[PDB]
Design a binder for this molecule. Structure first.
Ligand SMILES: Nc1nc2c(ncn2[C@@H]2O[C@H](COP(=O)(O)OP(=O)(O)OP(=O)(O)O)[C@@H](O)[C@H]2O)c(=O)[nH]1
Ligand SMILES: [Mg+2]
Lengths: 83, 285, 944, 89, 170, 283
């Protein structure tokens, strides 16, 4: 798949379709979605990492939304990005 | 166990031969069963056709809901969970003149296809451009001629700028004999040659054109290049076999392409159209 | 053990308080039941100090949420709280709440806990609660039980459990029974009426389409409540406990207005409206006669309570004001109101002592709301047949009271409230009454005996009389002129600030209902302006609160009547400017004064002409420079008048640049203080305003006059790029550097290194994106000017003793991946062309690390993960990365050279590649070998 | 919207021991889509400013740099470039 | 010297901590750090008639940090309810704060302060400000940056507590 | 979502679509009725062949030379040359051949070659199933839909239980399961009347003769403890869902999944294809 070719897990196709639905430009570069897919998979990686960190801060393996919130607390730049 | 099989007495061996014969007779009975199921499925397709036709008219906006059907839809909404359809006070203040500015369902079949798991992954944005003009998807069972089912995609020539064909169709064929499990087994498929308005509007190839005062051949010549590309409309024109190339190259071709083609066709015919409304809204997932 | 915890947790000292709180939470986590029971015991014992008992109940209310039941959103686990202990606490809390022996603080704490427990338990898990409450109310008329049920209605009862649950019918039955019992004490009836208010509040969220089970219940309850209230209003109680009678009347009328407003017209019939109207008028009259008993001073709250009750009675009369009123009941209403709307001796003394409070109340900005406001609401609301009759009544009563100095002020206020109603007062004999009214008002003006406040009210109410009746008065113009002149003369002669301010506000009303210039004539209008500015001068010495805002509004009205230029008078313009400046700078932080000075100042500068621009310059500019110097002494700390000053400095500079350059007077005045502001200041808003002003000044001042201060604009550029200012301030540089390049196009070249050093040092330090392109656009712009001079600085300039090219080329071309915008991007292409065509060996070979070489593995490298697998990059030379970026945007928009030889980004950059191929083949081929095939093609096909 | 399985994969790759609730995936996905939409809107702003009107790698790097804080943005850009290079190879 | 406990109370984020900090040191503070628990700051004012002293209990306006919050109101003699003119939710929170103050201490004098008036973007105005007119508690529009009405709440409270309407600060 | 946010034309059209969908559902119910009629009709044809092969396997019926030969062509075409007769086998006398009437462990071998059900078979199960004489299938027509399975044992010579025939029933839910098929619902089966606990292969036996130490009585004890076996196919999970069975319902759901997989394997493969699975060619 294109995601595997890009070295990404998250869907390049869904990113491209979400980009399409906004009609953000008259023609689309194949680099735009792949790049963005990687950016958002990076945000997922960072958020998740802090989320697991918080979960273990809660002495456990299972994350729930409170623990995502404390993950956002643990990293101020996500705090200002997500509010 | 070959040792055991050799160990079986002769008498048990003709017994097993007769049992194999009984299995074969059951195979012919399965063939008749499949014939009867195909005939009755075609009959029920004929039974189905008007309701698909009516919902297609609704999808295209050619027909307007009548308040009995509106009320029946409302009471179905009250069942399970479809409260999205309950009309609010704000919309009742609207007028048909404002609402009918957009006629039909925008990108109904596009979203219905792109909600289908296996098929959606093949639809590029260039393909999706044509699917915007898709307004109907019909099924036809090849009762006449070789057995199979044919998929129909409909368009408006006066609307779409890509091709002059109002209807694009894809065909699947089965072999004359049933499979080992008793289900139908497939034969090579065929697809229609789309009458593209121009090669620029073609979606299944990439072109390059260039002019050279070619010093090598003393030719002031123009060169055009055409290269097939991956696209959903490659679903049509399926591969065919040439014996010498079939043995080496097209063996892997039939191993890969035919499986995906048949799976996509089966998914469409079974999952999609009977629940096209639910696939459109995603409730069929 | 619990005792020292509750003592320590009360301590002001942070250490003891924090440690006690933490020990308490730890102990409650270990065994919740032990701590809960200990707290309940502390709350129960009378031996403990009442502070300890309050602390126990409040802390227990907190601890319940986190350790009582997982039905709470909070639930701190390990909550060992058995049904045993929960029942003990449920018992103890009722025993505290319903005991008459307990202090109201303990009752309130206990009810506060019962309300929390009810949140998760009320209709299903603690059924004994309502049984005990209803028993106490129904069989003992317990006030505590009614208050507790009222809190329950406030905080925990809900629409579904009110209507479909049992709560509503049971409560309404109990309430009606308590009100119907003759033996029930009056205070119990008051509590039951409050509880009725709560029930009505629940019932109000209803609609005609809803379930019949709700609808019929609502209808029947409203019918019974109206019957009971009508019956209650016939009771009388004599002299005993008049305060409670007033509170009883007050709550009855509050319920009646609630029923009148919040429910359908069918639930409160018109005939019942008439009956309650009659009873309301009679209750108003009665409440007035207790106000004569007020003179006994039997209890101080008596006057207060009389006014509070009358507020609700007048509010009910307002709600039913569409009903017809007979003549005698209008007389009763008017008499009662003249007694009620009378100013107290306290308010009279306050207004006489400090006119600022009078001004604040009169202009409508005082916070207080009282019976005079409700009378304003009543008269403002009347329809025409009622209003035309009430006006005759009040005007007639003014005539007969002219001899009294007690009721005349109240009567004038009542007339004022009548005249603010929007309808037209028309009738058979309003001509005659109106003539007498204007005659008596004129006599109030003439007389020397009149006390201050009657005179002030008359001054304020004549504008209203003229305004309302402007069509009925046959000679409105001389009347208006004479009244205004007389009022102004009194204000000038008077030594009471109160009458002066009253006259100023009345002037505002004349400016409201008439164009003064047309009705007075130019000379009389000019003399009026002179008088008004004189009075403002006299009043302004002692303005406080909203008086500055009111003075600024009346000054705005004065300014709007200034004559046109061929007859404009210099000194009145000087006086207007002096007043706006002085009033504003006297209260610089008052935002309303600042904004109204904004409108006033823009009006003054609206008559601006190039024929009189010098006069305005010489008039304004010294004062503004005084402001700048006075803020300089205060280190330019935020003062929004300084902000407005700077804004109008900018716009004043933008008004008449019809000459190619603004007059050098503006330069001479502004440049030194304005630079004195860009230097020696440290705040975002002050520097933002000062830099836009200074940039506009540079944008239109003469270069020849400005050459002497060119080093000063250098200091501005450097100190604005210096890290003394925030990056927020730094981003503003664009306009100013563009301006200097416009106005020093040729003179800037010798100093560009001083430009370059400041721009680069901020560049490498900043991580703010939008900042660095702005600096990089400049650095692009420098090389578009001359890349040779730019680089000689770049090669010579250093940070951390390394050549700036090693710093700039990498960071600039790294950011060239995010530089965006066609012109800006064109500036880059021109910049790179200037570089590439300079072609010194540095440009040919400096490594700009243009190519990524990703770290291995398809896992996504987090910031933390980058600490052990950072991404890696390839040190390609400058030309390699830049051309890749070029051809890339060409994509988004020597054998080749042989075939090439046979205004917009694409046109702009293609010649560069043509020019490159025309001037450096070897580099072009060298770069070609580093170029990718797809880029090679695009480069080829774009050139072709 | 659903990125559930890919969220699982990223979680294991970053924390093999860790679990995650469906509501947590929904909230994370909401964050993902909101950040996608803001980045894409800024990219469209760029594509509107310049007649080029084509969105590729560049405008996205710009939008990510403008929107994300510096330390998030640097490695987000790093991963974007990594994926683009891996795809292009 | 008469000293009074003043519990400064009000929604989180609204300006309580910087207001006390400026009265204490005179310098504004741009950034937001949520207070946890309470800080007690002893203020002082020099007046005619002598001296006025306050201990200001600056409470955490965030419920996640309001640990044992009502227990701070026990011996309060006066209070300030602070809301923010630019965020209407903080104003709608006002009646609840008032009720919580009353429940613990019934009849102390209360003053209501609308902070951050020094911005053009104010979302609630004096017209909507009506909770005072009913409960009869004084109301002022203040700001901590520009120092508009900077000392009036304390002046009004000191006049009310000392019972001396001619009191004024110097 | 936004489809609902669109003007009321969109809601009314999609309400009409839902009405038409209910009409499709009615027609699809009638389609299911017609099909179930058709599989019942062709199951009436299936049954004679299965009974004939079962009689052949049990030895109650003998093949015919035409059947033998036509099986010979069939085997030759299949390439399964293992079944071919050899001269050495022909040398066997009639007395040697007739020592066994039926095919020894035919169904045992077929189930052993069957992927999953083979795992359930134990040694005692293998011994017992030698007494199995037929596997039959039937459709449930009355009331709620379902299908039934049946097994036949020679109870006369069976030393393990007296049950001549054991029947297992499978069930579907009342209405149309989504996607146009039926989803499972709980199954019921019979109880095996074991001759004795020693021969009960679903139970391991312990024999104890004791003199009680407390009461000093004399007693002989026969003790029972259930064990897993191929006949745990019978005594299926009790009910789909009930208040008192939840703790049981966990294992009931697990065993329901396993048992429906086993039954579907039977219905699709073993009953229609028995000979190849016995010979292992179906592997
Ligand atoms: N412009 C302006 N900003 C102000 C003003 N008063 C306070 N601020 C800002 O608002 C914030 C003050 O909130 P804090 O005092 O920290 O918060 P709080 O209201 O005590 O609430 P918690 O800390 O949550 O208990 C700071 O960021 C100040 O810069 C004002 O009058 N004007
Ligand atoms: Mg704070």
């Amino acid at each position: 798949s294109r995601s595997a070719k890009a070295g990404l897990t998250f869907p390049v196709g869904r990113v491209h379709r979400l980009l399409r639905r906004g009609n953000y430009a008259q023609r689309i570069g194949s680099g735009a979605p792949v790049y963005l897919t990687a950016v958002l998979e990076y945000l997922a990686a960072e958020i998740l990492e802090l989320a697991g960190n918080a979960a273990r801060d809660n002495k456990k393996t299972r994350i729930i939304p409170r623990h995502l919130q404390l993950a956002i607390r643990n990293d101020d730049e996500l705090n200002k990005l997500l509010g | 166990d070959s040792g055991y099989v050799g160990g079986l007495p002769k008498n048990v061996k003709e017994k097993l031969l007769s049992l194999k014969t009984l299995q074969s007779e059951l195979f012919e009975v399965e063939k008749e069963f499949q014939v009867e199921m195909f005939e009755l499925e075609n009959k029920f397709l004929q039974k189905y056709k008007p309701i698909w036709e009516q919902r297609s008219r609704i999808i295209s906006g050619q027909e307007q809901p009548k308040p009995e059907q509106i009320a029946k839809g409302q009471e179905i909404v009250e069942s399970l969970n479809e409260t999205e359809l309950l009309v609010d006070e704000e919309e009742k203040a609207q007028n048909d003149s404002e609402e009918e500015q957009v006629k039909g369902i925008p990108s109904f079949w596009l979203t219905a296809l792109e909600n289908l798991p296996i098929v959606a992954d093949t639809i590029t944005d260039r393909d999706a451009e044509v699917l915007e003009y898709l307004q109907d998807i019909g099924l036809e069972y090849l009762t006449d001629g070789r057995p199979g089912f044919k998929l129909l995609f409909r368009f408006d020539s006066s609307a779409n700028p890509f091709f002059t064909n109002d209807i694009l169709a894809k065909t699947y064929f089965y072999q004359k004999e049933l499979g080992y499990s008793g289900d139908f087994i497939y034969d090579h498929a065929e697809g229609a040659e789309i009458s593209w308005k121009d090669n620029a509007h073609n979606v299944t190839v990439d072109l390059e054109m260039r002019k050279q005062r070619n010093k090598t051949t003393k030719q002031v010549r123009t060169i055009e290049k055409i290269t097939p590309i991956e696209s959903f409309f490659n679903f049509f024109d399926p591969p065919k076999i040439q014996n010498e190339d079939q043995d080496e190259e097209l063996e892997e071709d039939l191993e890969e392409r035919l499986a995906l083609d048949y799976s996509i066709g089966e998914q469409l015919k079974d999952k999609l159209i009977p629940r096209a409304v639910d696939w459109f809204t995603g409730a069929a997932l | 053990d619990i005792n020292e915890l509750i003592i320590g947790a009360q301590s002001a000292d942070k250490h003891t308080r924090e440690v006690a709180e933490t020990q308490l939470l730890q102990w409650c986590d270990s065994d919740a039941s032990q701590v809960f029971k200990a707290l309940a015991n502390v709350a129960l014992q009378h031996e403990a100090s009442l502070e300890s008992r309050q602390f126990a109940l409040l802390s227990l209310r907190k601890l319940i949420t986190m350790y009582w039941s997982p039905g709470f959103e909070s639930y701190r686990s390990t909550s060992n709280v058995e049904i045993d202990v929960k029942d003990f606490i449920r018992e103890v809390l009722l025993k505290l709440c319903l005991n008459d022996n307990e202090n109201t603080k303990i009752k309130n704490g206990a009810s506060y806990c019962i309300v929390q427990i009810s949140a998760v338990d009320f209709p299903d898990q603690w059924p004994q609660l309502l049984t005990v409450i209803y028993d106490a109310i129904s069989h003992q008329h317990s006030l505590n039980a009614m208050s507790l049920l009222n809190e329950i209605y406030d905080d925990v009862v809900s629409e579904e459990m009110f209507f479909e649950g049992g709560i509503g019918l049971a409560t309404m039955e109990i309430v009606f029974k308590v009100l119907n019992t003759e033996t029930s004490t009056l205070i119990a009836k008051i509590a039951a009426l409050k509880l009725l208010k709560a029930c009505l509040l629940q019932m109000s969220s209803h609609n005609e389409y809803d379930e019949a089970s709700r609808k019929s219940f609502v209808s029947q309850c409203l019918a019974t409540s109206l019957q009971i209230l009508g019956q209650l209003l016939t009771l009388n109680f004599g002299n005993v406990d008049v305060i409670s009678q007033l509170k009883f009347k007050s709550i009855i009328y509050e319920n009646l207005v609630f029923i009148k407003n919040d429910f359908s017209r069918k639930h409160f019939s018109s005939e019942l409206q008439k009956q309650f109207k009659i009873m309301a008028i009679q209750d108003l009259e009665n409440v007035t006669h207790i106000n004569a008993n007020v003179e006994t001073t039997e209890s101080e709250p008596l006057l207060e309570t009389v006014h509070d009750c009358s507020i609700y009675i007048v509010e009910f009369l307002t709600s039913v004001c569409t009903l017809q009123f007979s003549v005698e009941e209008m007389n009763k209403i008017i008499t009662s109101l003249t007694i009620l709307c009378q100013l107290s001796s306290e308010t009279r003394e306050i207004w006489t002592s400090d006119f600022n409070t009078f001004v604040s109340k009169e202009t409508g900005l005082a916070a207080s709301y009282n019976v005079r406001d409700q009378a304003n609401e009543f008269f403002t609301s009347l329809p025409n047949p009622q209003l035309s009759l009430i006006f005759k009544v009040v005007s007639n009563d003014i005539e007969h009271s002219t001899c009294n100095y007690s009721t005349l002020e109240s009567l004038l206020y009542l007339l004022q409230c009548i005249l603010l109603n929007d309808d037209e007062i028309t009738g058979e004999n309003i001509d005659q009454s109106l003539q007498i009214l204007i005659k008596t008002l004129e006599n109030i003006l003439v007389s020397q005996e009149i006390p201050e406040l009657i005179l002030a009210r008359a001054i304020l109410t004549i504008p209203r009389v003229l305004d309302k009746f402007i069509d009925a008065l046959p000679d409105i113009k001389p009347l208006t002129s004479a009244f205004l002149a007389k009022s102004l003369n009194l204000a000038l002669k008077s030594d009471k600030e109160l009458i002066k301010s009253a006259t100023l506000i009345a002037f505002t009303y004349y400016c409201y209902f008439a164009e003064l210039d047309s009705v007075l004539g130019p000379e009389v209008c000019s003399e009026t302006q002179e008088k008004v500015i004189r009075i403002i001068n006299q009043v302004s010495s002692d303005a406080e609160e909203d008086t500055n805002g009111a003075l600024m509004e009346v000054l705005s009205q004065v300014i709007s009547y200034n004559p046109k230029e061929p007859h404009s008078r210099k000194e009145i313009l000087q006086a207007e400017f002096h007043l706006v400046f002085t009033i504003s700078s006297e209260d610089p932080a008052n935002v309303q004064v600042v904004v109204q000075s904004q409108e006033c100042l823009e009006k003054l500068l609206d008559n601006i002409n190039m024929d009189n621009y010098k006069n305005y310059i010489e008039l304004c500019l010294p004062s503004f420079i005084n402001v700048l110097d006075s803020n300089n002494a205060n280190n330019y700390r935020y003062s929004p008048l300084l902000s407005l000053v700077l804004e109008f400095i900018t716009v004043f500079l933008k008004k008449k640049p019809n000459d190619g350059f603004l007059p050098d007077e503006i330069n001479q005045y502004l440049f030194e203080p304005l630079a004195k502001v860009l230097a020696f200041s440290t705040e975002d808003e002050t520097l933002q305003l000062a830099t836009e002003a200074f940039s506009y000044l540079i944008f239109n001042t003469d270069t020849r006059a400005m050459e002497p201060r060119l080093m000063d604009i250098m200091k501005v550029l450097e100190r604005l790029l210096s890290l003394e200012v925030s990056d927020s301030a730094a981003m503003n540089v664009g306009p100013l550097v563009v301006a200097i390049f416009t106005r020093f196009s040729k003179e800037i070249q010798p100093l560009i290194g001083r430009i370059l050093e400041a721009v680069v040092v901020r560049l490498i330090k900043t991580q703010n994106i939008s900042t660095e392109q702005n600096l990089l656009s400049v650095l692009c712009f420098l090389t578009c000017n001359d890349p040779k001079q730019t680089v000689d600085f770049l090669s010579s300039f250093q940070i951390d003793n390394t050549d700036a090219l090693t710093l700039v080329m990498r960071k600039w071309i790294e950011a060239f991946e995010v530089i965006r915008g066609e012109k800006r991007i064109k500036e880059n292409i021109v910049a790179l062309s200037n570089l590439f065509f300079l072609n010194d060996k540095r440009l040919q070979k400096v490594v700009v690390n243009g190519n990524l070489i990703p770290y291995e593995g398809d896992l996504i490298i987090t910031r933390s993960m980058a600490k052990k697998m950072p991404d890696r990059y390839v040190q390609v030379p400058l030309y390699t990365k830049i051309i890749k970026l070029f051809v890339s945007e060409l994509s988004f928009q020597d054998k080749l050279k042989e075939y090439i030889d046979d205004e917009s980004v694409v046109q702009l950059l293609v010649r560069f590649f043509k020019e490159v191929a025309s001037k450096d083949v070897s580099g072009f081929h060298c770069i070609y070998e580093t170029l990718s095939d797809s880029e090679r093609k695009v480069l080829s096909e774009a050139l072709l | 919207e659903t990125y559930s399985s890919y969220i699982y994969k990223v979680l294991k790759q970053t924390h093999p021991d860790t679990g995650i609730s469906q509501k947590s995936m929904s909230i994370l996905n909401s964050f993902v889509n909101d950040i996608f939409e803001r980045i894409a809107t800024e990219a469209s702003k760029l594509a509107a400013y310049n007649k080029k009107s084509t969105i590729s790698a560049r405008e996205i790097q710009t939008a990510v740099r403008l929107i994300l804080p510096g330390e998030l943005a640097k490695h987000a850009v790093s991963e974007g470039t990594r994926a683009v290079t891996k795809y292009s190879s | 010297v008469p000293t009074f406990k003043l519990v400064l109370v009000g929604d989180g984020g609204t300006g309580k901590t910087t207001f006390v900090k400026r009265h204490l040191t005179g310098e504004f503070e741009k950034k937001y750090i949520a207070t946890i628990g309470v800080e007690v700051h002893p203020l002082s004012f020099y007046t005619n008639f002598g001296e006025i002293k306050f201990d200001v209990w600056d409470t955490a306006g965030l419920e996640k940090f309001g640990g044992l919050r009502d227990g701070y109101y026990i011996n309060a003699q006066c209070a300030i309810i602070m809301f923010d003119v630019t965020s209407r939710i903080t104003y709608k929170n006002v009646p609840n704060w008032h009720r919580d103050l009353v429940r613990v201490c019934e009849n102390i004098p209360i003053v209501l302060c609308g902070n951050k008036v020094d911005v053009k973007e104010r979302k609630v105005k004096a017209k909507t400000i009506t909770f005072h007119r009913k409960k009869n508690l004084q109301y002022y529009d203040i700001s901590a940056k520009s120092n508009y009405n900077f000392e009036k709440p304390f002046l009004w409270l000191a006049r009310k507590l000392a019972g001396n309407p001619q009191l004024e600060f110097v």
